[PDB]
Design an enzyme around this catalytic site. Structure first.
Site, mmCIF file in Angstrom:
data_model
loop_
_atom_site.group_PDB
_atom_site.id
_atom_site.type_symbol
_atom_site.label_atom_id
_atom_site.label_comp_id
_atom_site.label_asym_id
_atom_site.label_seq_id
_atom_site.Cartn_x
_atom_site.Cartn_y
_atom_site.Cartn_z
ATOM 1 N N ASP A 1 42.540 50.732 31.670
ATOM 2 C CA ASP A 1 41.622 49.678 32.089
ATOM 3 C C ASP A 1 42.253 48.917 33.252
ATOM 4 N N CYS B 1 33.719 54.064 29.561
ATOM 5 C CA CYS B 1 35.097 53.626 29.425
ATOM 6 C C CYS B 1 35.127 52.629 28.282
ATOM 7 C CB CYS B 1 35.590 53.015 30.703
ATOM 8 N N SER B 2 35.654 51.427 28.526
ATOM 9 C CA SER B 2 35.587 50.371 27.516
ATOM 10 C C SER B 2 34.364 49.490 27.749
ATOM 11 C CB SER B 2 36.869 49.525 27.513
ATOM 12 O OG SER B 2 36.961 48.774 26.317
ATOM 13 N N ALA B 3 34.283 48.899 28.938
ATOM 14 C CA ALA B 3 33.100 48.171 29.378
ATOM 15 C C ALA B 3 32.083 49.104 30.019
ATOM 16 C CB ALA B 3 33.489 47.077 30.376
ATOM 17 N N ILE C 1 32.170 49.999 33.293
ATOM 18 C CA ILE C 1 31.888 49.552 34.658
ATOM 19 C C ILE C 1 33.015 49.851 35.651
ATOM 20 C CG2 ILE C 1 30.207 47.815 33.922
ATOM 21 C CD1 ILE C 1 32.426 45.676 34.432
ATOM 22 N N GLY C 2 34.257 49.662 35.217
ATOM 23 C CA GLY C 2 35.408 49.801 36.099
ATOM 24 C C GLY C 2 35.732 51.250 36.417
ATOM 25 N N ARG C 3 36.292 51.934 35.427
ATOM 26 C CA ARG C 3 36.617 53.342 35.561
ATOM 27 C C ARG C 3 35.336 54.157 35.686
ATOM 28 N NH1 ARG C 3 40.519 52.833 30.452
ATOM 29 N NH2 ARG C 3 38.906 51.219 30.131
#
EC number: 3.1.3.48
Lengths: 292, 5
Positions: A190, A226-228, A230-232
């Site tokens: 993350d 990913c986790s959210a 949005i990022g990765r």
């Protein structure tokens, strides 16, 4: 698709000159300009009572305008957004790492949207805290029933940077079965970038090849999370789109791709390091491919 | 988790 070449597509050589002129800080400032655009859309469904607990993070809602709705329901909500790809409508579904209370929503979505490939770019836990739930049967012959959908693990292959799991989804109401391939990429934390552009690009081709193979045996979106989500997720998808346009037309535009993506999965690409990584990965690919 | 940022 929102991702069409126009109107400022750059060649690979123009890209080199562009990045050289701007340098890292110029690229970081470019990311800030992206961040500053006011989002086109609203987040009401995400913020409704009943749906609040279906979001992993209080600060990562999802757009009303592009969200994936669940039909065979206890709401139609899942934190998941339809995302266009290069010359392809709804090429991806960008979504958060499933929570225990959303595992069944996740599988309903996978079933309903005819998904054949899932891409996971997170570990369950990273740096102490929970990042994603264990929403699939981890070991070969294990199964989990999510209502009328039974998911069975048919085999797991371990690779250098990812694991490939073959799953069967059995809809016991309709009496139908489908195989889904699950890819977990392990070396992309993350808030960060992968340890190697090359490993992510290899990973992308593996994913592409599996999607093409699955489709021929039958276009469904690839679930990317990913986790959210949005990022990765934004970084993975943005790189995919840019490389696809580069392959087909010998051009690309990172700024355009990311700006457009953020109108579909809000907040796509979460740090300037991630944004810069998109340019760097493309240039490293170009060099290794002899366009250098 | 509870806030991503």
């Amino acid at each position: 698709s929102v991702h069409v070449p126009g109107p400022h597509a750059m060649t690979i050589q123009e890209l080199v000159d562009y990045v050289n002129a701007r340098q890292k800080q110029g690229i970081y400032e470019e990311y800030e300009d992206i961040r500053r655009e006011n989002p086109v859309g609203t987040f009401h469904c995400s913020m409704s009572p009943g749906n609040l607990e279906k979001n992993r993070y209080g600060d990562v809602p999802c757009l009303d305008q592009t969200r994936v709705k669940l039909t065979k329901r206890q709401t139609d909500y899942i934190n998941a957004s339809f995302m266009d790809g290069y010359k392809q409508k709804n090429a991806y579904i960008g979504t958060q790492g499933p929570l225990e209370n959303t595992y069944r929503d996740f599988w309903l979505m996978v079933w309903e949207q005819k998904v054949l490939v899932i891409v996971m770019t997170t570990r369950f836990e990273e740096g102490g805290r929970r990042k994603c739930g264990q929403y699939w049967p981890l070991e070969k012959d294990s199964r989990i029933r999510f209502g009328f959908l039974t998911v069975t693990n048919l085999g797991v292959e371990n690779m250098n940077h990812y694991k490939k799991t073959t799953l069967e989804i059995h809809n016991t109401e309709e009496r139908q079965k489908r195989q889904v391939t699950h890819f977990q990429f392990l070396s992309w934390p993350d808030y960060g970038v992968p340890s190697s552009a090359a490993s992510l690009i290899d990973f992308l081709r593996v994913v592409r090849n599996q999607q093409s193979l699955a489709v021929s045996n039958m276009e469904p979106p690839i679930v990317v999370h990913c986790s959210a989500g949005i990022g990765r997720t934004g970084t993975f998808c943005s790189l995919d789109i840019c490389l696809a346009q580069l392959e087909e037309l010998g051009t690309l535009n990172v700024f355009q791709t990311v700006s457009r993506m953020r109108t579909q999965r809000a907040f796509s690409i979460q740090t300037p390091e991630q944004y810069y990584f998109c340019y760097k990965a493309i240039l490293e690919f170009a060099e290794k491919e002899g366009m250098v | 988790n509870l806030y991503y940022w």
